[PDB]
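Researcher: Going back to the complex we discussed earlier. I've cleaned up the inputs and rechecked each line, so this should be the final set. Can you rerun the prediction on the complete assembly and write out the structure?
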Amino acid sequence: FEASTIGPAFFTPQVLALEVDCNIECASLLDLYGQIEVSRSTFTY
Amino acid sequence: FEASTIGPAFFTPQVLALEVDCNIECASLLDLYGQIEVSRSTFTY
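Model: Rerun complete. Updated structure for the full complex:
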């Protein structure tokens, strides 16, 4: 029963516990800006 | 009887223990890469 003459169904592959992830996100400046809290869609100053 | 008249076969030289060796094995990058071990011929990720 040479592997070259039988179906893949008999050979279950190993499952690695890794996950390639190439995505990145650039640093944010949000901490510099001034923080304001509101409770309505419109405001005045 | 003297050397330069008798043949070389009458003298047995001393045998030293040191074994000269000039070859080198360059340092490998292998330990920088990511290390994985698989007990099977195929793996998935």
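Model: Worth noting: Chain B has no helices and one strand.
Researcher: Good, that matches what I expected from the previous run.
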